[PDB]
Each structure stands twice: as C-alpha cells, then as structure tokens.
Amino acid sequence: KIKGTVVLMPKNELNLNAFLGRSVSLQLISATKADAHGKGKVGKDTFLEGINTSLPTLGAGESAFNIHFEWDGSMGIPGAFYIKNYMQVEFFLKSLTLEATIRFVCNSWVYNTKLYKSVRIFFANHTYVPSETPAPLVSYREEELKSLRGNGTGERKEYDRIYDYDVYNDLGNPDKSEKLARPVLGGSSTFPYPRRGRTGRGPTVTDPNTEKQGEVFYVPRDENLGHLKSKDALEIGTKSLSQIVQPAFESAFDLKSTPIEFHSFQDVHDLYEGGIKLPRDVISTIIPLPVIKELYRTDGQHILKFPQPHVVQVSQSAWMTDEEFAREMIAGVNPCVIRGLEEFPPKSNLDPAIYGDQSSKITADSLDLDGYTMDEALGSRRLFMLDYHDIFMPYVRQINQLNSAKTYATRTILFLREDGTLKPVAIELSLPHSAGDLSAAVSQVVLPAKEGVESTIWLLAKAYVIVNDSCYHQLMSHWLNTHAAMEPFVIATHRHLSVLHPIYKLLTPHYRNNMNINALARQSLINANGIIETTFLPSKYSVEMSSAVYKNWVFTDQALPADLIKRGVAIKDPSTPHGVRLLIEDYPYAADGLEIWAAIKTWVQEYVPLYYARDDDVKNDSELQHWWKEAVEKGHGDLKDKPWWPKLQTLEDLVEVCLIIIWIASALHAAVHFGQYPYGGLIMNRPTASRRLLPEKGTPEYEEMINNHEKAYLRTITSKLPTLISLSVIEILSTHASDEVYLGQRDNPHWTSDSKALQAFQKFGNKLKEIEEKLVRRNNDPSLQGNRLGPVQLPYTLLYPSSEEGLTFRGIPNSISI
Numbered sequence: 001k002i003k004g005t006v007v008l009m010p011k012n013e014l015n016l017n018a019f020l021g022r023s024v025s026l027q028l029i030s031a032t033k034a035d036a037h038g039k040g041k042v043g044k045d046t047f048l049e050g051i052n053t054s055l056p057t058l059g060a061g062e063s064a065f066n067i068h069f070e071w072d073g074s075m076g077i078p079g080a081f082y083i084k085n086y087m088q089v090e091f092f093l094k095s096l097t098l099e100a101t102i103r104f105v106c107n108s109w110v111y112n113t114k115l116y117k118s119v120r121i122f123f124a125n126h127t128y129v130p131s132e133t134p135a136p137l138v139s140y141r142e143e144e145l146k147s148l149r150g151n152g153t154g155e156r157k158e159y160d161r162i163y164d165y166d167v168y169n170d171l172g173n174p175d176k177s178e179k180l181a182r183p184v185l186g187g188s189s190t191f192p193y194p195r196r197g198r199t200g201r202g203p204t205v206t207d208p209n210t211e212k213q214g215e216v217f218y219v220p221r222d223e224n225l226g227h228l229k230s231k232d233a234l235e236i237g238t239k240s241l242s243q244i245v246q247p248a249f250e251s252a253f254d255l256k257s258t259p260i261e262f263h264s265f266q267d268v269h270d271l272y273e274g275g276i277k278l279p280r281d282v283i284s285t286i287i288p289l290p291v292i293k294e295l296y297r298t299d300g301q302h303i304l305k306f307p308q309p310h311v312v313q314v315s316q317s318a319w320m321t322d323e324e325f326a327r328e329m330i331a332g333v334n335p336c337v338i339r340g341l342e343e344f345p346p347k348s349n350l351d352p353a354i355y356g357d358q359s360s361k362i363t364a365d366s367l368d369l370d371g372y373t374m375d376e377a378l379g380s381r382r383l384f385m386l387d388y389h390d391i392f393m394p395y396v397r398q399i400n401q402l403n404s405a406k407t408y409a410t411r412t413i414l415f416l417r418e419d420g421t422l423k424p425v426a427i428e429l430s431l432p433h434s435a436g437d438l439s440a441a442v443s444q445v446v447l448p449a450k451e452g453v454e455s456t457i458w459l460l461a462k463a464y465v466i467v468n469d470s471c472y473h474q475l476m477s478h479w480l481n482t483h484a485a486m487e488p489f490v491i492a493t494h495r496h497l498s499v500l501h502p503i504y505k506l507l508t509p510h511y512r513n514n515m516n517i518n519a520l521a522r523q524s525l526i527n528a529n530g531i532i533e534t535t536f537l538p539s540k541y542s543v544e545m546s547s548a549v550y551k552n553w554v555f556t557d558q559a560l561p562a563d564l565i566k567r568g569v570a571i572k573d574p575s576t577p578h579g580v581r582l583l584i585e586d587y588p589y590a591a592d593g594l595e596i597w598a599a600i601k602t603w604v605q606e607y608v609p610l611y612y613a614r615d616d617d618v619k620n621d622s623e624l625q626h627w628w629k630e631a632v633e634k635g636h637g638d639l640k641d642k643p644w645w646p647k648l649q650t651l652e653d654l655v656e657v658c659l660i661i662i663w664i665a666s667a668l669h670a671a672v673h674f675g676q677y678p679y680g681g682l683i684m685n686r687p688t689a690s691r692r693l694l695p696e697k698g699t700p701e702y703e704e705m706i707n708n709h710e711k712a713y714l715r716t717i718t719s720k721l722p723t724l725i726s727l728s729v730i731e732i733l734s735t736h737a738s739d740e741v742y743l744g745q746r747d748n749p750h751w752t753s754d755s756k757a758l759q760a761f762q763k764f765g766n767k768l769k770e771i772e773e774k775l776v777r778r779n780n781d782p783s784l785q786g787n788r789l790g791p792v793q794l795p796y797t798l799l800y801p802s803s804e805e806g807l808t809f810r811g812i813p814n815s816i817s818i
C-alpha cells in the first residue's frame with residue numbers, strides 16, 4: 001500500500017468529517033506502466049480515510065487527510081492522479097504527497113464531479129519538455145491541454161477552466177444607452193489592441209458586436225484567487241467602489257451636504273488631517289464593506305479620513321517646486337516617458353494640414369540653461385523633454401468639445417544641471433487649429449516664474465502637463481503596457497504549455513491574479529462610465545486612446561535596455577556592467593531597474609540551459625512553438641505583421657522572450673503601480689483632469705489667477721467629487737495584499753523536483769536580497785539626495801524587491817496582481 005496525504009481547504013476558509021466516507025476519491029496514474037494503448041495504467045478509486053493531525057507545519061486554513069492506495073510495484077511509479085469530488089460544495093485541493101517521496105502541487109478548485117466533462121487530473125512535480133514526457137503520460141498531457149483550450153464557443157461558467165481570446169467589445173453598455181456605446185478595441189486596423197480572456201456571454205440586444213453585461217466577468221476558475229483574509233481581496237474593491245461607494249458619494253453632492261468644490265489647498269489637505277464630513281448614511285454605506293472600510297479612518301458617524309500621502313509626509317508644499325516636478329519624471333509614478341532631445345526646436349510628425357503649423361514656439365534664447373548655450377546643452381546631452389505633443393494633439397479637439405474637459409497637447413523641456421538634477425525650463429501648451437474653429441484659444445509657451453501672476457500661469461502650465469502625464473501613465477504606462485499587454489501571454493501559456501513544461505513553471509508565477517484584476521477592470525475600471533472615464537480627462541475617449549498608442553507598442557522595446565536607448569536617456573556601452581550608460585547618471589527608476597533587470601536575466605539564463613541544450617531543442621519543442629505562435633498571431637494578433645517579433649528558434653530568443661515577460665509583469669508593473677497613492681494621493685501633485693484652458697486677460701478668470709491662485713488652480717484640475725473617487729481607487733491599488741508573492745518567492749517550495757532549478761531559484765532570491773542592500777545604500781547616499789529623495793524627501797523604494805503588506809511604496813510582486 002502507498003501511504004498518501006491530501007491537503008485541502010474547505011470552501012468556507014475563503015466540517016472535516018464530510019470529506020470522509022465516499023465523498024472524495026483519487027486514482028493514481030502510472031508514469032512508467034501503460035495499458036494496451038500506451039496510456040498510464042489507472043488504479044482503483046480510493047477515498048479519503050481520515051483527518052491527519054501530525055505535522056505542525058500546516059497553516060492557511062488547510063487540513064490534511066490520510067489515504068492509502070492499492071498499488072503494486074508492477075503498476076510502475078505513479079506520476080499523476082485523477083480526483084472526483086462527490087460532495088455538493090467545491091473544495092480547494094492543495095496537494096498530494098506519496099511516501100516511499102512523490103509530490104503533487106495542485107492548488108486548484110475541485111467542483112462536484114457531475115460538472116466536469118472529464119475528470120480532474122493532476123501531475124507530479126517533475127518537469128519535462130514534450131520530448132521528455134514519459135511515454136505513458138504523453139496522451140494525458142496533450143488531452144489536458146486540449147481540455148484547457150475549449151472549442152471557442154459557449155458561455156463560460158464559474159467552474160470552467162477554459163482559456164481563450166476575445167477582443168475588448170465588453171466595455172460598452174449600448175443596451176442601457178447609446179451614449180454608453182464604445183468602439184470594439186482589437187481586431188481592426190483602426191483599433192488594434194491586445195486580446196483578453198474570452199467570457200462568451202453573448203451579444204447585446206442593440207449591437208451584435210458588443211458583448212452583453214454580466215454580473216460576474218468570468219476568468220478560468222483557478223485564476224480567481226481566493227483570500228484567507230477578506231482585507232486581501234483588493235481586486236474586489238474596485239467593484240465595490242464603483243457600484244456601491246461612488247453612488248453614495250454622488251448623493252452627498254446632489255443633496256449639497258458638502259461643498260461641491262475645494263475652495264483652497266487646505267480643503268484638500270483636510271482629507272488626510274481632520275478628514276471630510278459626510279452624511280451619516282453615506283458613512284454607513286462605506287464602513288461595513290471589506291477592503292473599502294480599510295481605506296479610511298472614521299468616527300463611525302460622519303468622518304472619513306484618508307491616509308497621509310507619502311509625498312507630503314515631510315513637506316506638504318514641495319510638490320509645487322520645479323525641482324520635484326522634474327524629479328518625478330525620473331523617480332515618480334510614471335518615470336519612463338522622458339526622452340533625450342537632440343535637436344532644437346523639438347519637431348512634430350503631425351500633419352499641419354489638419355492641426356495647423358506644428359512648429360514649436362519655444363525660442364532657445366528664452367531658456368535658462370544655467371549659462372549653457374543651446375548647442376552646448378544639446379551636444380553634452382543635457383537636454384531632455386516630456387513630450388505629449390504628438391500623442392495628445394489628435395485627441396485635443398474632441399476632448400475639448402466635452403463639457404467639463406479642456407486640455408492642451410503639452411511638451412516640457414528639461415535641462416540636466418551640472419549637479420545632476422533635472423530642471424524644467426519651458427512648457428509649450430499646444431492646441432490644434434483649423435479653419436472655422438469656434439474657439440479663439442491659442443497655443444502658448446510658458447516659462448518658469450516664482451512671483452506674481454506669471455508664477456500662477458507657470459503652476460497651471462505644470463498642471464496641464466501632469467494631466468497629460470497622468471492620463472498617459474494610467475492608460476499607457478500602466479494599463480496598456482502591463483495589464484493588457486501581458487494577458488495574451490497568460491492565455492497562451494495555459495493553452496499550450498503543460499503544467500509539466502519548464503517554461504510554464506518559469507513563467508506562471510508571474511501571471512498570478514492578472515486575468516482576475518483585468519476582468520474586474522473591464523467590468524468597473526475601463527468600462528463605459530466606469531471609474532477611469534468618470535475621473536480622468538479623456539472621458540469616453542480614454543480606452544480608445546490606449547488603442548491608438550498600442551499601434552506603436554513594440555514587444556522588444558519593453559526590454560529595459562532597449563527602452564532606455566530608444567528614449568535617448570542611455571546609450572549602448574559594452575564597457576559597462578549592464579551594457580548601457582545612463583545619460584542621467586542618477587535616474588532612480590533606470591538605475592535601480594537595471595539591477596533588477598540583470599538579476600532576472602541571470603536567473604532566466606541559468607534556468608533555460610537546464611532544459612534546452614542547443615538552439616535546435618527550442619525549435620523542436622512543439623508546445624513552445626505553438627505557444628509563441630499563438631501568443632503572437634492571436635493574442636497580440638493585430639500586430640502579427642510587425643518585423644520585430646522574436647522568432648524563438650534559438651536559446652537566445654527564448655531567454656529574451658522570457659526575460660521581457662518577467663520584467664513587464666514584475667518590476668515594470670511595480671514601478672508604475674505602487675507609487676499611485678504615494679504620489680497621487682495629493683490631487684494637486686497628480687491631477688487626473690483639467691477643466692478649462694488658460695484665461696484671457698481682462699476676464700474675471702484672469703483676475704482670479706491674480707487674487708486667488710489656489711482657487712484658480714482648483715477650478716482647473718479634477719473636481720472634488722471625482723477626486724474623492726480617484727483617491728479611493730488608487731489607495732486600494734497602492735496596497736500590497738498580505739498574501740502577495742514577491743519576486744524571488746514562489747507559492748510552493750516544491751514547484752519542481754529538479755534540484756538544479758531549485759538551486760538557481762535560490763540564487764536569484766539571494767541576489768535580490770543583495771540588490772535591496774545596494775538600493776538602500778543609494779537612498780542613504782547624500783550625494784544622490786536630489787533625485788532619489790527630492791524636496792519631498794521621499795526615498796525611492798519602488799524597486800526594493802521586498803515589502804510587508806500595506807501601502808508601502810516598495811516591493812516587487814511577481815506579477816500584475818492589482
């Protein structure tokens with residue numbers, strides 16, 4: 001008899017005896033002895049015998065069960081097993097351990113046997129490329145993959161484990177209102193877009209191309225992460241905020257129970273100090289909700305108090321400094337858009353026949369480059385820019401036609417001072433111009449000013465820039481480049497790489513909760529009249545703008561070195577450790593990022609060789625080839641015609657592809673995600689919208705700039721209501737769940753039986769700890785204070801590998817998990 005132990009979690013953990021009797025049966029499958037068809041022999045249905053209470057090591061609401069299998073040596077060595085749950089309620093199977101040791105890491109929900117087309121099968125923790133699969137498991141290996149792919153049809157149900165693709169045609173809500181109709185993103189040259197997980201709810205009544213609404217947006221069952229602690233279900237918070245809290249906030253404003261607008265900057269600071277007083281029933285709607293209740297301190301009656309944002313923890317006014325404005329471009333929430341500027345004036349590739357003369361109005365002689373001439377600044381590579389002119393110009397006219405939205409396509413010129421810090425030297429606020437324009441508003445250039453109305457105009461100019469930046473950051477740097485771009489690879493991986501596959505094991509930890517947060521996002525974050533549309537500048541144009549940007553998305557340019565080189569902030573240099581020399585030496589995001597990038601590169605470079613000896617071995621891996629082909633031709637199908645896609649016929653290519661995927665999912669996402677509330681928790685520092693253009697002299701609006709600059713600023717940026725909603729969502733997002741799995745960690749120490757792979761993973765983890773010590777030394781280095789801390793005195797810790805739970809401003813999760 002083979003002694004076995006089954007560890008599982010009853011549904012109520014997210015009694016024992018109910019699992020005994022004939023409730024749960026398992027059948028071992030042989031990996032060495034096959035029947036007359038080459039398929040591993042199957043043992044007899046074996047039921048759980050009893051509750052085991054021996055080894056202390058057994059937490060997380062887990063329970064262990066004893067079981068003995070009738071298995072003779074003549075049946076070979078078990079390498080897999082079937083399991084059938086005869087109970088009505090599903091349970092979470094953690095693992096099976098056979099002694100005499102064979103391990104099975106399952107971590108999967110097992111629903112009642114009648115709901116499955118085929119019996120749930122689980123494999124032992126061994127790792128095999130297709131050609132190494134023991135012959136008696138080959139068919140079982142391919143059948144499970146076929147099962148995971150489904151047939152492309154049907155409405156997906158909660159227990160389904162079917163991975164497939166579909167376009168973003170589920171954001172609009174045309175059946176509710178024509179105003180909620182949205183273009184389908186993906187599948188057209190007009191709107192290319194990464195694919196998302198297929199749900200199959202069917203067409204809406206008014207539009208066959210739009211998927212009907214659903215109360216629950218399906219994701220393959222095991223992608224929907226349960227949490228032992230409800231406070232850790234952060235992804236569900238977006239839904240509660242949109243469906244329950246937002247309406248409650250709106251009622252307080254409709255009933256005029258709180259001023260509609262912030263009237264001074266102190267009104268904004270009050271949010272995290274004394275707080276904001278709201279109607280009793282409004283507080284009562286919020287205080288009992290899981291996750292939402294953790295967002296604010298309350299007296300339980302009328303007060304909501306937000307946590308003090310990191311950016312104001314030392315100086316509440318430092319965000320207003322030109323120093324901090326520029327520093328956040330290299331160490332802020334969106335540190336990856338700035339580019340080197342090698343010619344002057346900056347040029348535009350936009351059609352002047354459509355937008356009017358696109359020549360920059362910025363004159364070189366007007367800039368203060370600390371004594372440098374323009375030619376000297378250009379040649380010494382000290383000139384940079386945050387360029388949103390070409391990106392935004394195509395949408396300015398339509399955004400500005402909206403009732404409470406007015407923006408400019410902005411461009412900010414930055415000069416790298418001799419002390420190594422960046423200083424903003426001009427901002428161009430551009431507007432498109434065409435015959436027949438009703439508006440008399442014109443483009444203009446604003447220069448730094450510390451006194452008088454000019455200083456107010458310059459402060460407002462910075463605000464229009466950050467509105468451009470916040471939109472680009474949330475929709476492109478964050479949503480498009482991490483969340484959306486990664487989902488196609490998650491789907492392809494489960495569809496074509498067996499759980500036995502080395503690359504599946506290498507990549508899957510980096511997909512944890514990605515499909516889940518994405519599905520919840522399609523439902524409440526990026527949907528018509530969703531959180532983003534109702535809080536950010538572009539309104540109903542928000543998501544389609546990210547499709548326009550995706551036209552220029554390049555997989556290989558996501559690699560950190562390539563990105564730095566492409567943006568002109570670094571140059572290739574073999575004589576350096578990372579192969580690139582930064583043009584801004586103390587560029588926190590880039591410098592810390594290169595360290596993390598290198599650690600991941602080493603790990604992948606050490607792992608791949610363990611399973612692929614030569615290039616031919618990669619070319620001959622059928623699953624790997626089918627995986628990559630599908631990821632590209634279907635997942636990111638609208639760009640399948642591009643030349644830059646790696647071919648994946650070499651070890652080099654496999655390493656590159658895995659390295660980039662891991663980078664995007666871990667460090668890239670953490671860097672653009674966990675600083676949201678730390679930096680944006682003060683709406684003045686990261687405005688999400690602008691509501692009017694600069695005022696004409698001789699108007700009351702112009703007089704206001706002179707007499708009440710704070711009010712002029714507040715009337716221009718995001719209004720108080722959407723601010724409250726936006727602060728709440730980014731507070732939720734910036735929080736690390738206590739059950740997060742960070743880079744250098746895995747959810748199970750037995751994910752593979754291969755000791756060599758396990759040793760390499762341990763080295764990767766040690767290297768990350770080593771890197772963290774180095775980053776701590778950088779933050780403590782006084783010579784780097786200007787860019788790593790700034791006048792806000794906020795140490796750049798976003799790329800520190802580790803973190804405790806909470807809103808910590810540090811820690812790199814393995815995946816896009818929130």
Ligand SMILES: [Fe+3]
Nearest residue numbers: 669673816818
């Ligand atoms: Fe995110």
